[PDB]
Amino acid sequence: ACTKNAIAQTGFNKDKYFNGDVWYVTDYLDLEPDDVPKRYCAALAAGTASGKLKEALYHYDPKTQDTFYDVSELQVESLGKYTANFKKVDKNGNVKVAVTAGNYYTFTVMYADDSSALIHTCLHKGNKDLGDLYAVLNRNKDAAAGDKVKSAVSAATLEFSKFISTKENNCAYDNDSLKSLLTK
Ligand code: HEM
Ligand SMILES: NCCc1c[nH]cn1
């Protein structure tokens, strides 16, 4: 299970974060891991679409080739803190698994600027036992974590050297699908 109440960034700028553009996960910290996809690719788009706050997700295991997209309408808990009931979709937004209660992640933006961010997420999916996951994001998929975001990792009482990089995995992303999924 999840154990963290992550604190949102002071003065979080929601319209800048949710500007409809793409964010790439460059490094992550799973608190509840194992033999799991040690190598992983993930990215999201976040924006307001016809007045609704939205996130589109992409996951790719470059070793198994397991691929999936999700789209959610976010609900606000407080500034920088959201609950997302997700639906699994194909890249075009056609529903594969409909929204259901019990399938949701929370999402806290702990730090963000115009190029980088640190988020916490707690995933819930049916009867499964899942733990916290932190992720370092960047607008550039190949960007090394800079001092702003690494300092924020430290400020969250975490150690960046423990985070796992995705940069070795040779991830390629469909940015266009992620942006268009925001409307679906
Ligand atoms: C912004 C970051 C992330 C968020 C919001 C996110 C959220 C989610 C959601 C919503 C699901 C379930 C999707 C579905 O069943 O339709 C999922 C599944 C999963 N995610 Fe992520 N994820 C993120 C990052 C990552 C990272 C970096 C990895 C690698 C450690 C990871 C590995 C997986 C795994 C292996 C699954 C399959 C879970 C299962 O069904 O047991 N995710 N994630
Ligand atoms: N224990 C990490 C579960 C996960 C996958 N995606 C988001 N969270």
Side-chain angles (χ1 to χ4, degrees):
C2 293
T3 64
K4 309 295 139 141
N5 178 4
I7 305 312
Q9 182 195 28
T10 297
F12 174 61
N13 192 329
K14 64 182 176 28
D15 290 354
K16 277 220 292 121
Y17 187 88
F18 294 100
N19 64 345
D21 198 10
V22 174
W23 292 100
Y24 303 100
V25 172
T26 61
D27 309 79
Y28 61 92
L29 184 70
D30 193 345
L31 297 193
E32 179 151 356
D34 209 280
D35 72 339
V36 244
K38 187 199 64 280
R39 275 27 253 171
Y40 214 82
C41 296
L44 54 92
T48 296
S50 308
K52 319 297 170 272
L53 194 69
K54 293 292 277 300
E55 227 160 53
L57 307 181
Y58 173 68
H59 290 64
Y60 179 67
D61 182 332
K63 271 289 239 150
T64 61
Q65 279 194 259
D66 189 50
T67 307
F68 45 97
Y69 288 89
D70 290 89
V71 69
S72 311
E73 240 258 58
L74 275 42
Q75 302 311 124
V76 185
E77 300 312 333
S78 60
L79 186 61
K81 252 224 199 281
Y82 304 92
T83 296
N85 282 283
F86 54 91
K87 45 182 195 202
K88 186 175 290 182
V89 297
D90 64 21
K91 66 162 170 194
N92 289 141
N94 310 302
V95 171
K96 297 185 75 161
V97 186
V99 167
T100 190
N103 280 9
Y104 69 93
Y105 57 99
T106 63
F107 188 82
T108 303
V109 181
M110 295 162 70
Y111 172 81
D113 56 42
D114 303 280
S115 35
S116 59
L118 170 66
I119 67 99
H120 168 277
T121 181
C122 174
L123 181 63
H124 301 261
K125 179 196 187 153
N127 55 196
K128 222 184 288 74
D129 37 284
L130 301 147
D132 307 81
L133 183 137
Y134 293 93
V136 169
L137 319 170
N138 200 281
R139 298 298 194 180
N140 185 320
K141 76 176 180 71
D142 293 294
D147 289 299
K148 290 212 211 161
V149 77
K150 296 194 302 175
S151 291
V153 173
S154 171
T157 316
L158 294 172
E159 173 50 47
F160 186 66
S161 66
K162 280 115 195 357
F163 281 57
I164 304 314
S165 184
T166 57
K167 71 193 185 340
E168 9 94 72
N169 308 151
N170 249 96
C171 306
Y173 306 93
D174 184 349
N175 275 199
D176 301 297
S177 295
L178 278 168
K179 284 170 151 161
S180 61
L181 279 177
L182 289 174
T183 70
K184 307 293 181 182

